[PDB]
């Protein structure tokens, strides 16, 4: 992005077998100003760094790098990645050096190894070392591994003759965890990029700026809720913002602070603040929120309230010092204490949610970046049917699938056969499928469907204003700015039993770009029942969280059967109450779906609040060659029968009734394919090919669910919706 | 800050809470501030556990510690009057009561000068509709919102060296603030508002004799307080409004309270429903308050027939508060409460005796001069064009809902938007807007507007009208 530094090049091989020589191509130095023995800065990962010298290579390329594999692990890398590269005129020399080696590599040889391994390798030759960097000194036919643990020059060195070592006698432990990154990947989480840019943003821009802290008056993030369903990466989150501009992390669980004892639960939180606050990068992670502090009703116990006002103490003890910013998981933020949902203190608020289909898609590749694919599986239709799953239920996917591609390997002798190359296969991921335990079902989500507009037609004119009513206020606002007033709020949807309605609805927001909500009459039910009508109103700010979305609502003849045999109900007044402080902006269209539009609480009528009503009537024979041209996809054939067959005398069917009459089609001749392959089987390419017949005893074996008294009802509305217009002006 | 005192261990309580006391003792003149003290003294039977008592028994025993002595003023900042204790807040004891609300659109405006007399605009931006609009916004949010306009002036900027060539001249503009907005979320939703809102009753036509009650009744309880004393008797307290529905969503109270220079506050309907139907007869008491400290204020109560409407299948417990709090009251605080019901056959029939509700003042349907003047009104705070015309309304527009008649000017004016995007169109193909609507751009949303007023309704107005028609004497 930043054309300030060219330092972005491509890791690669050396030729020189020094560890503290790294090369260069001649054209490329001059660029950089390095000198004949510059020693520069080579940042990696996990903001590490490692000093070396560049030497002039003919053979090296302009945009690559050469290394070796001891420069390649102290800048935790490989190869083909990008690092930076920054000469550094202000490097002196050494004057104490403590190292220890590393204890595998010294079993079975003792004695003084200083005047062994330490002494030929420091003596005139002025590599310049990097503390906790790894270097490896060859002596004796075998390879010693040495750590640097302290330098008097703290930051950095160069090992002086006059320089003294200190290699006293403690092996140190090596750790395997330290090597690949932990995790600072901007590509190592997705599925959450339409957020996730936003979140880069508020996080990037106090970082890295702070003289703009002087131009933007007040700091807009000082603490940050993340709020979700649990396993969606929230950790990997704060991980991923962590080491990606050089902040000290420091992941607190919820539980370590209630673990302590009293006095001891009061301790280690202004501590951690206090060490946060040395350093001048500084985040805080804090896992389960709420088990520090939930409801005040929830509390009962004299600790917990003492540790929630501790925690509102230290937040807002600090006021625009140091730029230090905090983040918290959240189950949901109705469990939070609202007291700490306020501004200057929890004010930015960002939500999460389940990956989409592309979202799993990438997250299914960067979990299987690091294991080897049979090369045979379709890997996106995997992630197609992976509806109400999570990250951690995709790595339990991906986890399930390599354990049965190992069971697809006997009790053998327990050495390297397939662990060299695996064979995971397609199957393998449907068998992990089969067993596959969800977590976001239960719960309703929101994404873009994927419609485009050309699964069903007609309504041409109704399409027209359905574009103008919502599509084109979110595109063109100036004509809003012009002559033009505030828009209508919502429509609402009567006509036949609505089957067509959802996919009616759900194609403007694939057209708009916009998010999309379905809130199912079920639920709704289910919210008037068990009493729970006031999570209508998150429901709602999930929805204007979600902005621009789309409102589905459906069956609104349902809750009023119950009362028409009152008026309104519990959760029909609440909806009232939560759209109308909806505003006229933020273009969150709502819709609402309903087969009996004569059994209306009528609150809702009048304009204002929903003016727009859409009357549909039934497809007609036009229209069956819509809804049939929908079923290339799902039921695919190519020739058998022309498609206009049955629209030539059929009076009325629905769509409902047409897919109907489809699948029992499908049914027929799967059946019939069914009957043709046992008896190739007894007398011992599935042909999926069908014929008129299946079609034939399809379009007899139906019934159509409408019902001709209730369209008459329909009509009866039409004639209604005859109005009081006159005949014409007289100028 | 209370906090400070609940972080601290038990006995350490009584540390940091008597401290200031004397150390007040010190400065004669001295204030002493506690935030968030709902956190400190809230209801004792909402808690669970002693030390909360010892520190709500120990801040009220040092209430009175300093009785005129050092003169010392002490101040809390309360989210909400029931959050406190009623113990605590008695009176003589803890008990003068002021409020603060929500800021009108004059106020987010002085508030938005506020926070940009520090920062440099780019001095393009109006910054007065934006404070007319944002509707239950804290101030608080609007410095967020100049925090999220400044973020754009950064973000609009791509990624520099790090210099001051934005960063010396901060640009903003109108749709950077509108779109901070979208990115944006209220936090003072749902809630009264206090302030009171402008009409300047030029919108209203015709209904002369209804003015001249209407200007009877509010308009001088404290323009003529000694000669409304003339006579001795108390203002009328109760006004009830009933007709057919149509052009009766608000606004008229509120102009007859804009003469008077006085607040007001609207109860909605469903928030009546909801209150009926969530068992929550306590939060009546708290806005009816709330409407009687924000004196002198005039209410509106609207739909109420929708309550009678759920007791159809005449009294229940939301009728029982409004009664008992409106009997419960002085005829002094310069309030009046006003009550919308389209139906007036299924109201209770403890309201409409004199005393608490006389007034039953008809409404009658728009007529002529009222739909110019609907017209009018549209033609009102809107851009608008020569050739426009109202005499083809005479026959049709004979008698007209006005909500009907605001649908069909926006109707009209989003078909104007439709030929603006044919106008867009138009331009695609190239590769003039004409924003005014065109002189028969009426004559197809005739056809998008439905008397839905029945004339039985009208003959039931028609007969309760003249079962309160009253006698005629002469000879
Ligand atoms: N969307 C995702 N992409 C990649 N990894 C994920 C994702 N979601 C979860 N994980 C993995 O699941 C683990 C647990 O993450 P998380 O649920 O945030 O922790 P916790 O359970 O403590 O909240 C992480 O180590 C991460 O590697
Ligand atoms: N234009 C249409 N008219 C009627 N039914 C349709 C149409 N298009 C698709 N369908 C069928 O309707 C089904 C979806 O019904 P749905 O919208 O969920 O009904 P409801 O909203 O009443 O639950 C799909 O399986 C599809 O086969
Ligand atoms: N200008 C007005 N302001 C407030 N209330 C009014 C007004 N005009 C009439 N009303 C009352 O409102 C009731 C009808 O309101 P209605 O028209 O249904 O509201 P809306 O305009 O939201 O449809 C009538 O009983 C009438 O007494």
């Known amino acids: 992005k930043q054309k300030n ?98 204890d595998d590599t010294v079993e079975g040889i003792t004695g003084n190894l200083f005047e062994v ?118 950790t990997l ?65 004299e600790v917990e309230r003492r540790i929630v006002s501790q925690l509102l103490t230290l937040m807002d003890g600090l006021k625009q010092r140091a730029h230090v910013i905090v983040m918290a998981a959240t189950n949901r933020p109705n469990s939070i204490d609202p007291a700490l949902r306020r501004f200057g203190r929890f004010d930015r608020e960002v939500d999460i949610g389940i990956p989409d289909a592309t979202g799993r898609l990438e997250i299914l590749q960067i979990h299987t970046k690091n294991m080897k694919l049979a090369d045979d599986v379709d890997l996106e239709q995997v992630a197609n049917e992976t509806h109400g799953h999570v990250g951690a239920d995709l790595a339990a996917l991906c986890s399930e699938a390599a354990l049965q591609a190992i069971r697809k390997k006997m009790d053998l002798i327990d050495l390297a056969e397939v662990m060299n190359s695996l064979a995971v296969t397609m199957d393998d991921f449907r068998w992990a499928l089969s067993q596959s335990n969800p977590s976001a079902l239960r719960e309703t989500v929101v994404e873009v469907p994927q419609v485009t507009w050309e699964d069903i037609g007609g309504l041409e004119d109704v399409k027209r204003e359905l574009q103008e009513l919502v599509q084109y206020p979110v595109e063109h606002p100036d004509k809003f700015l012009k002559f033009g007033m505030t828009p209508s709020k919502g429509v609402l949807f009567y006509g036949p039993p609505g089957c067509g309605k959802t996919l009616l609805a759900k194609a403007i927001a694939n057209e708009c770009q916009a998010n999309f909500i379905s809130i199912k009459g079920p639920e709704l039910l289910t919210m008037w029942f068990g009493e729970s009508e006031a999570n209508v109103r998150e429901i709602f700010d999930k929805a204007r969280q979600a902005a621009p979305c789309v409102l589905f609502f459906d069956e609104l003849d349902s809750i009023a059967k119950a009362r028409g045999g009152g008026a309104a109900d519990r959760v029909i007044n609440q909806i009232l109450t939560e759209m109308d402080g909806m505003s006229t902006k933020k273009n969150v269209f709502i819709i609402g779906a309903t087969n009996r539009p004569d059994i209306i609480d009528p609150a809702i009528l009048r304009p204002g609040r929903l003016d727009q009503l859409i009357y549909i009537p039934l497809p007609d024979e036009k229209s069956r060659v819509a809804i049939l041209k929908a079923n290339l996809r799902k039921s695919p054939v190519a020739k058998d029968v022309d498609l206009e067959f049955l629209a030539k005398m059929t009076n009325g069917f629905s769509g409902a009734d047409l897919t109907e009459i489809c699948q029992r089609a499908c049914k027929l001749a799967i ?24 079609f034939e005893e399809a379009m007899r074996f139906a019934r159509r669910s409408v019902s001709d008294n209730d369209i008459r009802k329909y009509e009866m509305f039409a004639q209604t919706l005859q109005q009081s217009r006159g005949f014409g002006s007289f100028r």
């Open 237 to 301: 989150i704060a991980r991923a913002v962590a080491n990606e501009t050089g902040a000290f992390f420091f992941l607190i669980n919820g539980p370590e602070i209630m673990s302590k004892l009293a006095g001891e639960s009061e301790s280690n939180l202004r501590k951690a603040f206090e060490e946060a606050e040395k350093n001048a990068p500084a985040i805080i992670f804090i896992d389960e929120l709420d088990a520090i502090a939930p409801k005040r009703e929830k509390t009962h116990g």
């Open 671 to 694: 059946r019939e394919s069914i009957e043709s392959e046992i008896r190739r089987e007894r007398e011992r390419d599935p042909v999926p090919e069908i014929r008129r017949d299946h």
């Open 117 to 234: 391994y330490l002494k030929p390798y420091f003596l005139e030759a002025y590599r310049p070392i990097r503390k906790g960097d790894i270097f490896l000194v060859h002596g004796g036919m075998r390879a010693v591994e040495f750590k640097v643990v302290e330098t008097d020059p703290s930051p950095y060195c160069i090992v002086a003759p006059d320089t003294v070592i200190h290699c006293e006698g403690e092996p140190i432990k090596r750790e395997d965890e330290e090597e690949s990154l932990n995790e600072v990947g901007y590509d190592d989480i997705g599925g959450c990029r339409k957020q996730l840019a936003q979140i880069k943003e508020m996080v990037e821009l106090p970082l890295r700026h702070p003289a703009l802290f002087k131009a933007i008056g007040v700091k807009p993030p000082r603490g940050i809720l993340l709020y979700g369903p649990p396993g969606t990466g929230k």
């Open 5 to 102: 530094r060219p330092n972005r090049l491509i890791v690669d091989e050396a030729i020189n077998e020094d560890n503290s020589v790294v090369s260069l191509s001649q054209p490329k130095m001059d660029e950089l100003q390095l000198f004949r023995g510059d020693t520069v800065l080579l940042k990696g990962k996990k903001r590490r760094e490692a000093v070396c010298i560049v030497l002039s290579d003919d053979t090296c390329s302009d945009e690559k790098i050469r290394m070796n594999r001891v420069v390649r692990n102290n800048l935790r890398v490989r190869l083909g990645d990008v690092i930076s590269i920054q000469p550094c005129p202000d490097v002196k020399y050494g004057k104490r050096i403590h190292v220890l080696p590393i």
